[PDB]
Amino acid sequence: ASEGVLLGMGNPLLDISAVVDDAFLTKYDIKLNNAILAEEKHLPMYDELASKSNVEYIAGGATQNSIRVAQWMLQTPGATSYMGCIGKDKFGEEMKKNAQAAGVTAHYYEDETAPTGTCAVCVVGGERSLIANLSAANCYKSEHLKRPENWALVEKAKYIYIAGFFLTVSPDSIQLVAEHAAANNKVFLMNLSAPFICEFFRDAQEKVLPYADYIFGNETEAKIFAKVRGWETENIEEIALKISQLPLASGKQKRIAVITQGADPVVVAEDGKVKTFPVILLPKETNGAGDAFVGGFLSQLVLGKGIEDCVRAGCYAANVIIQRPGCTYPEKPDFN
Amino acid sequence: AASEGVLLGMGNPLLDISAVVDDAFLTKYDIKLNNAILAEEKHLPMYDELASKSNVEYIAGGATQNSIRVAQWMLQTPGATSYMGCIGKDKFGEEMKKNAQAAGVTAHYYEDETAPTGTCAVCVVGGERSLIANLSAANCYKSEHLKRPENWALVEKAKYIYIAGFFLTVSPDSIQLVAEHAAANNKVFLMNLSAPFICEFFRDAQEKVLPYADYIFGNETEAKIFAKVRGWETENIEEIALKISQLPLASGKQKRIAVITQGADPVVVAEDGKVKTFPVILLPKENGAGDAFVGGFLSQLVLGKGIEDCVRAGCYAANVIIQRPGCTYPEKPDFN
Ligand SMILES: Nc1ncnc2c1ncn2[C@@H]1O[C@H](COP(=O)(O)OP(=O)(O)CP(=O)(O)O)[C@@H](O)[C@H]1O
Ligand SMILES: Nc1ncnc2c1ncn2[C@@H]1O[C@H](COP(=O)(O)OP(=O)(O)CP(=O)(O)O)[C@@H](O)[C@H]1O
C-alpha cells in the first residue's frame, strides 16, 4: 500500500445527509426510495439542511465514495488519490475538508463560475431521498490532469478507477490515462455506469473498453450493455463472460468482469470461466452499496489478494454502508 | 397557412460547421467516418482549417433546432416557428443567429457570460459523415431566460411545443414548466426518447414529464432500451410503441401517439389502442434523418392533417436531408 497507489477520477458531489421528518418531505415534495435531479424549488433546501445541527457533510460522488471506502478499508495513510471538478464556494471548501478527513489526497479542478456539485441525502429509517445538482462536477478539463502536480498522481498510481459516467464529462482524460496504464504496466478499472446512451457516448465507451483490466457493473447495467451491442442473451453469468472477452488492447493480457446482483450472488468472469459468490451478511443486519462494493474490492486488489478476498471485502463494505445514513463508516474496519 | 410562432422548440443548439473532406484531413485529425466523437475543447487547428474550405457551410444545428428548421422549410409560412436555447457570446454565436434568421426561425437564445457557443464539425465524404461535437454553452440553459416575458410570449403563442429528451439533463425545470403549461392551456407538448436514461436521477426526471407528452417520437434502438429500463420484457417494436402510447396520462390529456421509426423498415405509429405500419417511400433515384422526420411530421401536424400525411411528410424530409451534406435542404419543398 504505497503513496497514491490507487487513484480515482469522477464527478464529485458534496452529499449533505440528514435525518428528516414528514413535514420536510411534504414541504419540498420529495418521495423516499427515489433520486431526482435538483430543481429551482429544491435549491433553498440545502440551507434548511445546513441549519440542522445533525447534518453530515461527505465528499460524495460514485467514484469518490469508492476511493474513500478503499482508504478506510486499507487504513494506510496516503494510499489513495482523487481528481475531480468543484466550484469556488463554501461547499467546495467542505468537500476539501471532508476528503482530507477521509484520508484521500484530493487534487480538485476549481471552475471559475459553476458552483460545487451537491446531493441532499434525506434519511428516514433505512430509506433515502437523493436530490443531486451536478453543476461543477460536469466541468472537468484535461488541462488540469496534464499539469505536472496532478499528472504525478497518475504516475504514482498502480490502480486507476474511473466510472463510465466520466466519459460524458471528460473523454480525453479517461482515454489518456487508460492508454498510459497500458503503456506503463498499470491496472485501469472502470464501471458500466453510462446513463446517457447516445451514439456519441457509445463510441466513446467502445474506445476505452480494450484498455479496461476490470469492468464493474450491476445486473441492470450489464443487461442494458448486452442489449445495446446486439447480445441476445439475458443470463447475467453469460453477459459477464462476454464482457471479460471483449477485444483487449496491446498492453493487456486478460480482463475480469464483476457483475453484482444486489441480494443475489456476485458474478465474476476470469480466464474463460464464471464463478458465483453468495452474499454473506454481517451480525443482525441500498444507497451507495455498489460504490462501497467497488471500494472494498479495490482495497484487497491493492494488497495483491485473490478474487474471493476482493468479493468478500466488497460485500463487507457494502453491508456496512447500507446500515448507516449515507455512504459513511466507523473509524476502523473489522474485516479478517 | 400557420399562425405566428405556432411551433416552438427548446434544446441544445450547436453550430454545425459542415464541409466535404478528403483522406488527408481525416488522417491528420485521426477521425473515423460513421462515428460520433465528443470534443472536450474546440480543436482550433481543425476548426480554422474547416472555416478555410470550399463549400464550407454553417448551420444552426442541434437535434431539436434541426427539426424546427425542417418544419419551417416544409411550412414556408414566414414567422411560423420559434426556438429557445443556450449559446455563447462569440463569433460562432453570431453565425448561429445569422443562420437561424436565414432558415426562417424566430430564435430567442440565452447568451452565457463565459461558455463559448456549442459547435459540431460535420466532415462529409460521400454519404458517410463524422461528427465532432463540443457542447459547451448548449448545456448551460437556465429557466430564468424562459420565465422572462419576451421569451415566455413564445410559449403563449405556441400551439405545438417540441423538446428532446436530452434537454432534461440541461434544464428539467424548463421542460416541466412548459409541459404542465401545455396541459393547462390546451397545447400539444411533443418529445422524443433521445439519449435513453439508465441513472435514477435522469430516469425519474423523464418519468415526471411522460404524462404531459401528447406525442413521443423515437427510433427502434431508443424504444428497445426504453422498454428494457422499465422492465417491459417484449422486444417487438409494434408492442413497445403501443405500451408507450398507453403510459399514464396527465389531467386533461385524453390520448398519446407514439411514433417509432425503424430506418429503412416501416414507421410504427400507436393511436387509440391500435398500431399502424407505414412503409418508407423513396424519392426518384435516391445522419440527421430522425431530426428531419420529426420536422416533416411537425409541419403537417401544425396544418391539422391526418397521421398518414405526417408520416409521409416526415419520410419526405428525411429522404431529402440524407441526399445532402448535413441537415440542409433546397429553397422550396415539393410535397403536397
Ligand atoms: N438487499 C441487500 N442485502 C444485502 N446486501 C446487499 C443488498 N443489496 C445490495 N447489497 C450489497 O451491495 C452490493 C451491490 O449491490 P447492487 O448491485 O444492488 O448495487 P447498486 O449500486 O447497483 C444499487 P442502488 O441503486 O441501491 O445504489 C452487493 O454485491 C451486496 O454486497
Ligand atoms: N436507409 C434508409 N433509406 C431510406 N430512408 C431512410 C433510411 N434510414 C432512415 N431513413 C428515413 O429516416 C427516418 C428516420 O430513420 P432512423 O430512425 O434511422 O433515424 P435516426 O435519427 O435514429 C438515425 P442516425 O443515427 O443515422 O442519425 C425513417 O423513418 C426514414 O424515413
Three-state secondary structure of chain A:
CCCCCEEEEECCCEEEEEECCHHHHHHCCCCCCEEEECCHHHCCHHHHHHHCCCCEEEECCHHHHHHHHHHHHHCCCCCEEEEEEEECCHHHHHHHHHHHHCCEEECCEEECCCCCCEEEEEEECCEEEEEEECHHHHCCCHHHHCCHHHHHHHHHCCEEEEECCHHHHCHHHHHHHHHHHHHCCCEEEEECCCCCCCHHHHHHHHHHHHHCCEEEEEHHHHHHHHHHCCCCCCCHHHHHHHHHCCCCCCCCCCCEEEEEECCEEEEEEECCEEEEECCCCCCCCCCCHHHHHHHHHHHHHHCCCCHHHHHHHHHHHHHHHHCCCCCCCCCCCCCC
Q: Which atom of ligand 1 is nearest to the CA of A218?
A: 17
Give the one of B38, B201, B221 whose C-beta lies nearest to A204's C-beta: B38
For residue A305, the one-letter residue type is K
Q: Rounded to whole angstroms, how far apart are CA atoms A312 and A266?
A: 10
Kindly list the protein residues whose Cβ atom lies closer than 6 A to any atom of ligand 1: A 218, 260, 262-263, 266, 279, 286-290, 293, 315, 318-319
Nearest chain B residue to A173, by CA = B40
Residue B94: Cβ within 10 Å count? 13
Give the one of A36, A113, A172 whose C-beta lies nearest to B201's C-beta: A36
Ligand 2 within 6 A of B105 CB? no
CB A161 within 8 A of CB A113: no
First to last CA, chain A: 17
CA distance, residue A229 to nearest chain B CA (Å): 10
DSSP label at B306? Answer: -
CB B19 within 8 A of CB B124: yes
Residues of A with a Cβ under 8 Å from any B Cβ are: 34-37, 39-40, 112-113, 130, 132, 138, 141-142, 165, 168, 170-173, 193-204, 220-221, 223-224, 227-228
Catalytic residues of A: 291
Tell me how the structure was determined: X-ray
Q: Rounded to whole angstroms, how far apart are CA atoms B303 and A296?
A: 60
Q: Rounded to whole angstroms, how far apart are CA atoms B261 and B276?
A: 12
Closest CA to A64 of A100, A112, A114: A100
Find out if CATH 3.40.1190.20 is the number for domain A6-12+60-116+135-322: yes
Ligand 2 within 6 A of B2 CB? no
Q: Which of A134, A197, A202 to mutate to test the interface with B (most CBs of B within 10 A)?
A: A197
Among protein residues, the one whose CA lies closest to atom 14 of ligand 2: B290
Contact B40 A224 (CB under 8 A): no
CA of B292 to the centre of ligand 2 (A): 9
Resolution in A: 2.4
CB pairs < 8 Å spanning A and B? 89
Q: Rounded to whole angstroms, how far apart are CA atoms B288 and A32?
A: 40
Give the one of A37, A203, A227 whose C-beta lies nearest to B225's C-beta: A227
Residues A125, A126, A132, A136, CA torsion sign: positive
CB A63 within 8 A of CB A11: yes
What's domain B7-13+61-117+136-322's architecture?
3-Layer(aba) Sandwich (3.40)
Which residues are within 8 A (CB) of A139 and not within 5 positions of it... i.e. 6 or more apart? A85, A109, A111, A114, A169
CB A25 within 8 A of CB A48: no
Which residues are within 8 A (CB) of B282 and not within 5 positions of it... i.e. 6 or more apart? B319
Q: 3-class DSSP state for residue B13?
A: coil
Q: Rounded to whole angstroms, how far apart are CA atoms A211 and B85?
A: 37
Give the helix/strand (H/E) hosting B181. helix B172-184
CB B326 within 8 A of CB B288: yes
